[PDB]
Every structure is written in C-alpha cells, then in structure tokens.
Design an enzyme around this catalytic site. Structure first.
Site, PDB file in Angstrom:
ATOM      1  N   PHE A  78     -27.291  66.946 -14.987  1.00  0.00           N
ATOM      2  CA  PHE A  78     -27.897  66.170 -13.932  1.00  0.00           C
ATOM      3  C   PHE A  78     -28.693  64.998 -14.517  1.00  0.00           C
ATOM      4  O   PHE A  78     -29.477  65.165 -15.478  1.00  0.00           O
ATOM      5  CB  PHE A  78     -28.785  67.128 -13.102  1.00  0.00           C
ATOM      6  CG  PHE A  78     -29.576  66.458 -11.983  1.00  0.00           C
ATOM      7  CD1 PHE A  78     -28.974  66.148 -10.790  1.00  0.00           C
ATOM      8  CD2 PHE A  78     -30.902  66.118 -12.168  1.00  0.00           C
ATOM      9  CE1 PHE A  78     -29.717  65.498  -9.807  1.00  0.00           C
ATOM     10  CE2 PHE A  78     -31.631  65.471 -11.185  1.00  0.00           C
ATOM     11  CZ  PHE A  78     -31.043  65.155  -9.994  1.00  0.00           C
ATOM     12  N   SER A 153     -28.373  71.551 -18.520  1.00  0.00           N
ATOM     13  CA  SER A 153     -27.880  71.727 -17.164  1.00  0.00           C
ATOM     14  C   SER A 153     -26.392  72.125 -17.164  1.00  0.00           C
ATOM     15  O   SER A 153     -26.002  72.984 -17.937  1.00  0.00           O
ATOM     16  CB  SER A 153     -28.186  70.382 -16.456  1.00  0.00           C
ATOM     17  OG  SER A 153     -27.797  70.258 -15.109  1.00  0.00           O
ATOM     18  N   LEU A 154     -25.517  71.527 -16.370  1.00  0.00           N
ATOM     19  CA  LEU A 154     -24.097  71.814 -16.291  1.00  0.00           C
ATOM     20  C   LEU A 154     -23.439  71.550 -17.650  1.00  0.00           C
ATOM     21  O   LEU A 154     -22.510  72.263 -18.088  1.00  0.00           O
ATOM     22  CB  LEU A 154     -23.557  70.905 -15.152  1.00  0.00           C
ATOM     23  CG  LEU A 154     -22.327  71.295 -14.319  1.00  0.00           C
ATOM     24  CD1 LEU A 154     -22.597  72.590 -13.582  1.00  0.00           C
ATOM     25  CD2 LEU A 154     -21.994  70.205 -13.327  1.00  0.00           C
ATOM     26  N   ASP A 177     -31.740  74.639 -20.259  1.00  0.00           N
ATOM     27  CA  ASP A 177     -31.740  75.160 -18.900  1.00  0.00           C
ATOM     28  C   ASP A 177     -30.343  75.120 -18.267  1.00  0.00           C
ATOM     29  O   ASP A 177     -30.066  74.368 -17.327  1.00  0.00           O
ATOM     30  CB  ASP A 177     -32.759  74.389 -18.033  1.00  0.00           C
ATOM     31  CG  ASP A 177     -33.263  75.204 -16.833  1.00  0.00           C
ATOM     32  OD1 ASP A 177     -33.672  76.363 -16.994  1.00  0.00           O
ATOM     33  OD2 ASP A 177     -33.236  74.677 -15.721  1.00  0.00           O
ATOM     34  N   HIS A 264     -36.286  71.563 -14.051  1.00  0.00           N
ATOM     35  CA  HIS A 264     -35.008  71.509 -14.757  1.00  0.00           C
ATOM     36  C   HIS A 264     -34.991  70.451 -15.896  1.00  0.00           C
ATOM     37  O   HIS A 264     -34.443  70.671 -16.975  1.00  0.00           O
ATOM     38  CB  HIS A 264     -33.958  71.264 -13.634  1.00  0.00           C
ATOM     39  CG  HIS A 264     -32.494  71.373 -14.033  1.00  0.00           C
ATOM     40  ND1 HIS A 264     -31.872  72.386 -14.639  1.00  0.00           N
ATOM     41  CD2 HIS A 264     -31.563  70.388 -13.822  1.00  0.00           C
ATOM     42  CE1 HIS A 264     -30.623  72.082 -14.826  1.00  0.00           C
ATOM     43  NE2 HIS A 264     -30.444  70.877 -14.331  1.00  0.00           N
TER      44      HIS A 264
END
Ligand SMILES: [Ca+2]
Length: 449
Positions: A78, A153-154, A177, A264
């Site tokens: 993100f 993230s992703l 994360d 995040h």
C-alpha cells in the site's frame, strides 16, 4: 482456469490459490506486462537516481550492480499519499552504513486495482523476482544467500512467493506488517512463512482484526522471529480506525475510502530508522505484551537481545525456532529508537503523596526525567519501574532525583532516596546512594556506591 506465459510459467485459480473460505473468489493474476514489475537499482555509486535493469546479463553488467556485495530488494504494498519515496529513502540510509545493490520493485500497475485482484497479482511480482535471482545465479555465479528481500504489506507475500520459487535458498526475507485479508490462515503455499528463506523476520504493527477493527496486518506468526513493537495493535503517534462490521476493502486499498494507515506504515518507518541506530531497537523475549509492560521481561537474555529491523540477522539464535516472540516499545516520531532502563528507588524521609522522577547522567549524555511512581511515598519502601529513554547515556556516572507533592502543605515535608539502582539492558547494574532528604522541586544528585 489456468493461463501460461513465457518466462514465468503457468498460474491457475485452483485451490488453495482461490476458492477457499479465506479467499473465495476464483480470479486469475493479470498478465506480466499488465502488472509491469520494474527493477529500479540504486547503489553507493548512484545513490539518488536509479538505473532501470531487467533480467538480462548484458543489462546487469552495464549497470552499477556489483557481484562482490549483498543485494537487497524492497517490494511495496500500500502506498499512501505523499509516501511514494519510502523505498528509495530506505536504500539511501543503507548507503550510509554498507556497500549494497539496493533494488526497488515497482508494481504500481498491478497493485492499483481491486484488493482481491492485487492479491492475485502478488504471484506475478514473486515470479519476476525469482526469475531475476535465477539469472544472477546462472550468469554471474551469484549465490541466492547474498540476497535479502524486504516486503511491506501485500508486498511481503510477493517476497514469500519469490522465496518459495527459489526453494527457500534466498538468504533473508523481512516481512513488514504482512497484510491479513485474503492471506492470514491460508496454507504456506499462498503466504509468507519461515520456509520461504533461510531466515525470515517479521515486524507486526497493525494486527487488530480487519473485520471489524481495520487492522491491515496479520496477527498470525510468519517468521523465525516475530517482533510486536508497542504490542503490535496501536502504534504511538497514530490515529485509530473506527470499528466496522462490514468494510469496503476496495475503497480502502484504492484510497477512495477513509482509512487511517498510520499503524500499517509504521513497520517500514521503524525499519528505516533501525539502519542508522544499530542498538536502538532491542527486542526482549517475553510471552506477551502485558508481561512486558508489567516489567517482567527485562534485561535481555544472556546471548543478547535481537535488534528489530536491519540488524536482526546478527542475532546468534535466529533460526533455533519459528514464531519466537519479541516485544519492545518505540518512540512516537522519528528517531523512533529507544533504550530501556530499569530503576529501583528506595525512599527515605517522611510519608507524602506525590510523584518521583529520576534522570540518568552518563559519559555519553543524560536523559529526560522519567516518572517512576505516583502515589503515597512510604519511607524505607522500594518502587521500581522500566522506561524507554530516547538517549543512550553510556556508562552511568550519576543519577538525579526530584519529587512533587500533590497537595497544599506548608510543613515542607522532606523526601530523599537512600539508594537508586540502575540496570541496563545487558544486565549491568549501577548503585547510587544518598544521605540527603529534600523538599519538593529540589534536585538531589546521587553518587555511586
Ligand atoms: Ca510461503
């Protein structure tokens, strides 16, 4: 359904890749050129502007890539407003402390779409990085153990897919994360997990449930070392998200819905500051965060604490187990580095009601005044507390004490500290003693004993 492409092979929506309770929709990843993964190389010799490279030996040889130093890949997830230089400023801190090929992996085209499609597109990014690691190996005899993949993230799950395609030969993956929706609780095949590299360290900063707390990070363990700074749910300096039984994940991922992303994004902010502060992020083994804040897990274990962040690979037992827990607290803004101390004060003088502050003075500097206790100050008693100092004082040479009375009392009670013991995170103990007692708002220096 199954599609096959040149270079990267085939991809299908067969279970577990789709159609299971955690990721119900059957949809395929976009094609490689629609994802348009890009490799942007920054090095010590070109620190400000990248050289775009591709998995082709002549192109690599024409760049500043050097086979005699490590390679670190950084893969995004993100991207919030105004955060688009985070990958290159993480590379620019590394050039201050080491020689490195730092490769930012841009896949903005494949991420700017619906969340469930971006989750699938992670597979393509994964395949592309494994494919370049493969070319480096076959053409330059460059071992995968010299590469480190960092994914946020992703992007931490694209890092896992690459590690899985290299059969875990990759030297290190750091998960910053790892995103939860469509990944937590799935098989290892689909997510980031310890078999994906020789060493995997994970930093947890937004672990409350996505439904309904809107924490985008997994609570589930995924590395040899799992760090939960500040407990992993609410980070200091960040806003909290309102609870929602049903949520709009595509609006959130696509930046059209309101979502406070502070929690995040803190994972890569702490990693960026760890590079320049090699002892500023000591993680303590502890069974939980509440035991940690109850002052039950200090000082570090005898072989040393792991450093959360860039230096976690210096930790001596780093692969002795998977899911090893470490807790620590950070600052609320940059520099986020903190150094924890334990202080025990034995009060002398009269009984009073107030709070007691202490300040440490060492050869490398002195700290702020921290509150050890607030309430009835009984003489002869010992009050203990651990605090996270924003200054590392060095070898202690003295300590200072002051108290404030929380009432109107013109008797002028006096309170002093007979002994104050300071323990650093290595277990070294310093004692300081006094004969004095003082009125409130008077600073008492204590000399070593
Ligand atoms: Ca995996």
């Amino acid at each position: 359904n199954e599609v096959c492409y040149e270079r990267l092979g085939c991809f299908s929506d067969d279970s577990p890749w789709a159609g299971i309770v955690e990721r119900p929709l059957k949809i395929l990843p976009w094609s490689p050129e629609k994802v348009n993964t890009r490799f942007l190389l920054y090095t010590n010799e070109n620190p400000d502007n990248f050289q775009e490279i591709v998995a082709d030996p002549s192109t690599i040889q024409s760049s500043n890539f050097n086979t005699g130093r490590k390679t670190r890949f950084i893969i995004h997830g993100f991207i919030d407003k105004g955060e688009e230089s985070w990958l290159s400023t993480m590379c620019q801190n590394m050039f201050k402390v080491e020689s490195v090929n730092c490769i930012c992996v841009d896949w903005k085209s494949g991420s700017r779409t619906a969340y469930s499609q971006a989750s699938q597109n992670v597979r393509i990014v994964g395949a592309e990085v494994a494919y370049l690691v493969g070319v480096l190996q076959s053409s330059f005899d460059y071992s995968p153990s010299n590469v480190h993949i960092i994914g946020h993230s992703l992007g931490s799950h694209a890092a896992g897919e690459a590690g899985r395609r290299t059969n875990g030969a990759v030297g290190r993956i750091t998960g910053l994360d790892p995103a939860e929706p469509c990944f937590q609780g799935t098989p290892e095949l689909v997510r980031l997990d310890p078999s994906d590299a020789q060493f995997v360290d994970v930093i947890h900063t937004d672990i409350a449930p996505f439904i309904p707390n809107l924490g985008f990070g997994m609570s589930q363990t995924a590395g040899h070392l799992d760090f939960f700074p500040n407990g992993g749910k609410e980070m200091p300096g960040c806003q909290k998200n309102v609870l929602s039984q049903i949520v709009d994940i595509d609006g959130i991922w696509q930046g059209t819905r309101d979502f406070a992303a502070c929690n995040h994004l803190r994972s890569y902010k702490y990693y960026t500051d760890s590079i320049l502060n090699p002892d500023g992020f000591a993680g303590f083994s502890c069974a939980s965060y509440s035991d940690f804040t109850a002052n039950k897990c200090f000082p570090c274990s005898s072989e040393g604490c792991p450093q959360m962040g860039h230096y976690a690979d210096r930790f001596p037992g780093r692969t002795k187990g998977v899911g090893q827990l470490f807790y620590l607290n950070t600052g609320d803004a940059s520099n986020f580095a903190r150094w924890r101390y334990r202080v025990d004060v034995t009060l002398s003088g009269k009984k009073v009601t107030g709070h007691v502050l202490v300040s440490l003075f060492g050869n490398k500097g002195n700290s702020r005044q921290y509150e050890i206790f607030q309430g009835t100050l009984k003489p002869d008693n010992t009050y203990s507390n651990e605090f996270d100092s924003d200054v590392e004082v060095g070898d202690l040479e003295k300590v200072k004490f002051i108290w404030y009375n929380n009432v109107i009392n013109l008797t002028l009670p006096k309170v002093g500290a007979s002994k104050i013991t300071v323990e650093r995170n290595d277990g070294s103990v310093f004692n300081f003693c006094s004969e004095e007692t003082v009125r409130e708002d008077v600073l008492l220096t204590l000399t070593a004993c």
